[PDB]
Amino acid sequence: LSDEDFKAVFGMTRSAFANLPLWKQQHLKXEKGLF
Amino acid sequence: LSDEDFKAVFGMTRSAFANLPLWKQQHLKXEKGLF
């Protein structure tokens, strides 16, 4: 994922995603079908 | 996009758009069918 792709996929920046708890990162990526 | 193209597609200025919450930027670009 490029930085723009984080915005397109998750509606937040790469660094905002990285600020989420681990379980939430895993679940959001689960929801999108990503690994 | 050209300045006038941007205004026609989004109905707002570049600055206004960039100042929106990121989730809303993404949803507007969902709504417009850009991707």
Question: DSSP labels for B1-35?
Answer: --HHHHHHHHSS-HHHHHHS-HHHHHHHHHHTT--
Whether residue B35 and residue A11 make contact (CB cut-off 8 A), yes or no, is no
- Say yes or no for a CB contact (<8 Å) between B23 and A12: yes
Domain locations along chain A? 1-35
Length of chain B: 35
Measured between alpha carbons, how far is A16 from B26 in angstroms, rounded to an integer? 15
User: CA B30 → CA A19, A21, B35, distances in Å?
Assistant: 25, 27, 6
Distance from C-alpha of A24 to C-alpha of A10, rounded to nearest angstrom: 12
CB contact at 8 A, B23 and A13? no
**Type of residue at B35:** F
Any B CB within 8 A of A5 CB: no
Pick the CATH number of A1-35 from 3.40.50.1820, 1.10.760.10, 1.10.3720.10, 1.10.950.10: 1.10.950.10
Q: Which helix (H) or strand (E) holds A22?
A: helix A22-31
Alpha-carbon distance of A23 to A8, in angstroms, equals 21
The span from the CA of A15 to the CA of A1, in Å, is 12
